[PDB]
Design a protein around this nucleic acid. Structure first.
Lengths: 142, 175, 206, 58, 37
RNA sequence: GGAUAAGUGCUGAAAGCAUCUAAGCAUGAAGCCCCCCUCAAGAUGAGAUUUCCCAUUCCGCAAGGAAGUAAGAUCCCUGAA
RNA sequence: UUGGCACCUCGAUGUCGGCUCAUCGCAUCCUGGGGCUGUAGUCGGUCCCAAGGGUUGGGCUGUUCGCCCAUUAAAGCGGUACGCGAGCUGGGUUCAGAACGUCGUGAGACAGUUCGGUCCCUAUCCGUCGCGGGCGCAGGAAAUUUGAGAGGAGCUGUCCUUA
């Protein structure tokens, strides 16, 4: 007989900044926070997460040759319809899909996936419109 | 027997300025040149003596210890005396002159060819045969003169067109 | 970086100073009035909106009145919009006649092309047909659908539907003669659109 | 049950490992990961069970 | 060119220099120009 | 136009020289991404401006509900671009 | 491809060749870029980067192939149930009818040959082309758009001048 919290959750607003880190390990512990797996009242089905705002996403880094290698493949449905985009292409043209697509794979799939995915947003530069909620500052474990 | 382990000296008229982490500006009579280096390298400047030191002996530090010296060695030569590269053209109808700064090539084509000294580099034309590009940066003066050779590379049957000062051209004897 | 809009009538055949006869449309553009000057500081882009027809009383709506009546000239039926003009030349309410154009420049023409209704996969996509004899019961049909194994038909194979009606542009046309005293533009070529249908008349990128 | 004990541990700096390996040496305690969460929702008393194992980590 | 996987220097004055990830033979003779890959 | 592929380059070590390299740069193709044109906010991330209509009558304690309207639209009817 | 193995299919998976609609790979036939050449020049040979676009019209053959005629800048190869028969044709083998040669005393045979021979269906679901009705879009309604995102188009020869 455990406690299954359902919509009685004090949600939260954390901000994780993107100064110079690797977007795998910067999406790593954000994705646990997007479901709130750090929170002690974790039910696995009623979205116990909290909202995450990322600032300065275009200034995020990659070791190795991944600035040129990791081609981001999207596909149409029309025949022969792949559209290749490299990393530096995603980096400078528009990077507001460059951390979203690195977390869309990392949030679990289903109807609850997109429901948790609405809690995410990413702003290029130092916009942070969001002056009405008192957002907090979070620092990752590494 | 090493490139990097000896020293460099400031003879006169040169104020090498250790300014930032790596941006070191070198001023003087021919020009005022700047260069960013790698932050692991440590370059200390004595009384008109230039010393370059690396932290360890690694695959990184073998490469950078010779280059950062030799680039500064080139920055000494450009600020003190500069650089110049002459270009002799060979042939019959081949000729060249300037329209102010713009080098005009009446070389072999159905059109003239324009060359722009973009970053303030002296292109001195003593005659229709010889053209001298004079400046301060080997990565600029050597860079521009190569693209001048890219306008008309020499051919091994009759060596014609753009050619360096003592450029020994391969000779094919095709009948 | 300009443009007015008018109403197609039909072809003529006009002489141009030689034996050279030119196919000529008759575009009449009663003098268009700018209804709103959209700025980049609030709308996020640089554009302008024309207007063209003499609306009646009963035709107009009240929101079509209050949009006009700021620069109160007249309610006008058709509203279109031109990205990328000189905004520094115009003000809200300025009457624009045919005086822009001459009889010698490269001129772009968009429009609303005609209709053909539900007519299918020969006239709608130009495809051929099977032979009309040698026992074949196949003609006028859209071809095979595809190979076996992908189990579906690919999005990009063509099929019967409703030909025409879409918006279609013809680039790099040219104006034969400018007759601005009846607000008439004469453009060299066949311009899409049926009788009494509306056409934007830009200046093309040569 | 186990990821809630993770979540109670990272507000204490510990792992799931250093709790359960700690509680085998803190006491020889039997706390049967269901009812470990029932102390988590009384978190003021839970960390006295946690930091006692942290002292028994060292 | 000569582009073949069994790159090896031919004459006395051939030099074997590794460029851009590949291994090249650069000599006086342009006929000696070999490159694996 | 932008960034490159093969090349073609400079500069320049490691490895006093040489070296189109590891740093630092420039070129370079009917390729690639925009530029051209059409489609497109159900882009559930549902955008953005322009004006109009305004906060009415009843339950109900509220929450909520219905029932006449505004702006406009429909049934319907003469119609074919 | 010629083939091995007999695993799915003999309570049926209709099989070659052309017509219809094309799509995909690159070991490229043209077009773009180049490197070397026994590259004078004009043609060329050869590897390399290139898949965006194109790839002719006929006589014979059931033809695929190939020969041939005539062009073209080029006449590419290969999939995709040797693509496509609930889209089409039935010439081809492979039904009985007929005949020739040979085999067999014989009935009859023959991937040897010749002549003639019914190709069925009204579309549930997914899939496409097109159109619409509802609600959504924390008020209702009227017009215009930014553009996420997609698609189409993306081939080139002769001649003039430099000469």
């Amino acid at each position: 007989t455990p406690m299954a919290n359902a919509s009685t959750i004090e949600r939260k607003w954390l901000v994780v900044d993107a100064a110079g880190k690797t977007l795998g390990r910067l999406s790593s512990e954000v994705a646990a926070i997007l479901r709130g797996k750090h929170k002690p009242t974790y039910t696995p089905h009623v979205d116990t997460g909290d909202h995450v705002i990322i600032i300065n996403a275009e200034k995020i880094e990659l070791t190795g040759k991944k600035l040129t290698d990791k081609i981001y493949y999207r596909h149409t449905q029309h025949p022969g319809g792949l559209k290749s985009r490299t990393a530096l292409e995603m980096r400078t043209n528009y990077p507001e899909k460059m951390l979203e697509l690195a977390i869309k794979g990392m949030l679990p799939k289903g109807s609850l996936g997109r429901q948790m995915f609405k809690k995410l947003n990413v702003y290029r530069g130092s916009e942070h419109p969001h002056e009405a909620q008192k957002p907090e500052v979070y620092e990752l474990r590494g | 027997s090493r490139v990097g382990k000896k020293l460099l000296e400031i003879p006169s008229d040169v104020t090498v300025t250790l300014n930032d982490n790596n941006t070191v500006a070198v001023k003087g009579p021919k020009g005022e040149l700047t260069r960013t280096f790698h932050p692991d390298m440590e370059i200390k400047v004595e009384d008109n003596v230039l010393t370059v030191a690396r932290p360890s002996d690694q695959k990184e530090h073998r490469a950078l210890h010779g280059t950062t010296r030799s680039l500064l060695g080139n920055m000494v030569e450009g600020v003190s005396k500069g650089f110049e590269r002459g270009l002799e053209l060979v042939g019959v109808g081949y000729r060249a002159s300037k329209s102010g700064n713009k080098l005009v090539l009446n070389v072999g084509y159905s059109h003239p060819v324009e060359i722009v000294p973009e970053e303030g580099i002296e292109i001195e034309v003593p005659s229709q045969t010889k053209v001298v590009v004079k400046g301060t940066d080997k990565e600029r003066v050597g860079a521009i003169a190569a693209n001048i050779r890219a306008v008309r590379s020499p051919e091994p049957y009759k060596g014609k067109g753009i050619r360096y000062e003592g450029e020994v051209v391969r000779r094919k004897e095709g009948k | 970086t300009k443009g007015i809009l008018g109403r197609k009538i039909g072809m003529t055949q006009v002489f141009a100073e030689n034996g050279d006869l030119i196919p000529v449309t008759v575009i009449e553009a009663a003098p268009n009035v700018v209804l709103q000057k959209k700025t980049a500081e609030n709308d996020g882009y640089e554009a302008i909106q024309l207007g063209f027809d003499d609306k009646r009383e009963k035709l107009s709506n009240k929101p079509e009145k209050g949009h006009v009546a700021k620069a109160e000239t007249a309610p006008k039926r058709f509203v279109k919009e031109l990205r990328g003009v000189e905004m520094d030349a115009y003000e809200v309410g300025q009457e624009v006649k045919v005086e822009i154009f001459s009889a010698g420049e490269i001129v772009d023409v968009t429009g609303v092309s005609k209709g053909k209704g539900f007519q299918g996969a020969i006239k709608r996509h130009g495809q051929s047909r099977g032979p009309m004899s040698h026992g074949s019961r196949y003609h006028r049909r859209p071809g095979s659908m595809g190979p076996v194994d992908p189990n579906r038909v690919f999005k990009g194979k063509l099929l019967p539907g409703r030909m025409g009606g879409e918006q279609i542009t013809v680039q790099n046309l040219e104006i034969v003669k400018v007759d601005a005293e009846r607000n008439l533009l004469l453009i060299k070529g066949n311009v899409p659109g049926a009788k009494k249908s509306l056409i934007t008349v830009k200046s093309a990128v040569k | 049950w186990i990821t809630r004990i993770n979540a109670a541990a990272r507000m204490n700096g510990l792992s799931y490992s250093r709790l359960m390996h700690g509680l085998k040496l803190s006491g020889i305690e039997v706390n049967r990961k269901m009812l470990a969460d029932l102390a988590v929702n009384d978190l003021t008393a839970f960390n006295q069970l946690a930091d006692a194992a942290k002292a028994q980590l060292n | 060119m000569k582009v073949r996987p069994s790159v090896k220097p031919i004459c006395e004055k051939c030099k074997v220099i590794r460029r851009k990830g590949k291994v090249m033979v650069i000599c006086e003779n342009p006929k000696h120009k070999q490159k694996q890959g």
